[PDB]
Write a protein that binds this ligand. Sequence first.
Ligand SMILES: Cc1cc2nc3c(=O)[nH]c(=O)nc-3n(C[C@H](O)[C@H](O)[C@H](O)COP(=O)(O)OP(=O)(O)OC[C@H]3O[C@@H](n4cnc5c(N)ncnc54)[C@H](O)[C@@H]3O)c2cc1C
Ligand SMILES: Cc1c2c(c(O)c3c(OC(=O)c4ncccn4)cccc13)C(=O)[C@]1(O)C(=O)C(C(N)=O)=C(O)[C@@H](N(C)C)[C@@H]1C2
Length: 365
Amino acid sequence: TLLKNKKITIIGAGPVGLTMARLLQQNRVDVTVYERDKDRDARIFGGTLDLHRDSGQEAMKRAGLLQTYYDLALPMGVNIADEKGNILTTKNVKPENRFDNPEINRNDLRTILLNSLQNDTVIWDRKLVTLEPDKEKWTLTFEDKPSETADLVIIANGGMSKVRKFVTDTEVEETGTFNIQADIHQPEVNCPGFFQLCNGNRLMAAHQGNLLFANPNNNGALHFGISFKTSTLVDFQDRNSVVDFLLKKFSDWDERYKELIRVTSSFVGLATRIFPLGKSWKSKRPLPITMIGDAAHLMPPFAGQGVNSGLMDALILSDNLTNGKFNSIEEAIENYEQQMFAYGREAQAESIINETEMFSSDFSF
Ligand SMILES: Cc1cc2nc3c(=O)[nH]c(=O)nc-3n(C[C@H](O)[C@H](O)[C@H](O)COP(=O)(O)OP(=O)(O)OC[C@H]3O[C@@H](n4cnc5c(N)ncnc54)[C@H](O)[C@@H]3O)c2cc1C
Ligand SMILES: Cc1c2c(c(O)c3c(OC(=O)c4ncccn4)cccc13)C(=O)[C@]1(O)C(=O)C(C(N)=O)=C(O)[C@@H](N(C)C)[C@@H]1C2
């Protein structure tokens, strides 16, 4: 009722935006998703994503996808190693905790979410450039593509979104650490020494403020990442400059780690950043609009709370908009933002605290 004959547009077909789209569409809501990726076959780079039971899994449950998540996700243990290649601890998943926090490849999650939507709910190859209000509808401008309108816009285009001004003037800021990620295909062949060291579990190692993390089985490929405090001699279009840089930092590390670096094809550098939730968001806005996911609360990932929190937003907002407990769309948005600020600020605190704690000189897991 609240959203009757209201054309809702979600900006961004990431895991958060898609989940939002499903929760709305399964409630008989007219919802459109705009995604800049040219087609659905576009591969999503990055590691695996873990769904927390009180948040991520609850969102999939309400979307009717919980069993699909378990069907596709893979439970994984964790090994803590040192720079010399020794396994300090073995956290081999207990059978009884096997279905607590399994790991679903990012593309798999995109696929199940898309499959839960009606055909053509997502419009590919649509990069939103500007968002300008009218007396009654939004005007959405896409780069070299026809513009569109909407009554309510939900921003979900990531932590580096540039279309936030109408909601908040808050700016993204760097937290002081840097992450270098990569994928190795057929790791058993290219990096056998380090592959066997993982031995099915995910290796986390820290020495001299340089932390290493690895998932040996991300849909057949090994995804790993290296992080450290930041501050540039490195060009990421030049894997040679990256290797020289990493081998100097990892000179103290065992050759099996050096083998991992030497075989990596493409390096991806990213500074750790946060979209702080300190100051409240704009009070009066021209038309109904809000934000969800990383666009709302980017935070360091060292606490594994990013996607889990973003899904909480999609769950709360969609619930508020369809449970008939709010007199207006604006009030329903306000309530969501009130709730989101509370637990979202907490999540940021944990991720930053864990960040500072992990890259401290005394850290030892
Ligand atoms: C290195 C790293 C590791 C992480 N590890 C974990 C982990 O182990 N566990 C965990 O639970 N979480 C983890 N996270 C958090 C997780 O990645 C995010 O919280 C989650 O992906 C946010 O989803 P989202 O859709 O809100 O944003 P994103 O995932 O950034 O997706 C945004 C979407 O918007 C689209 N888009 C971009 N530009 C535009 C545009 N102009 N117009 C329209 N659409 C656009 C993008 O293509 C994409 O579809 C990690 C994050 C990082 C960076
Ligand atoms: C430190 C940390 C990492 C990861 C986590 O998932 C963590 C986590 O997640 C959960 O399991 C969980 N969440 C909520 C509820 C229950 N359980 C919880 C706590 C800490 C985690 C990664 O997966 C990681 O992405 C990873 O492996 C790689 C890589 N191999 O490339 C990265 O380099 C790292 N960073 C810096 C890019 C990441 C490290």
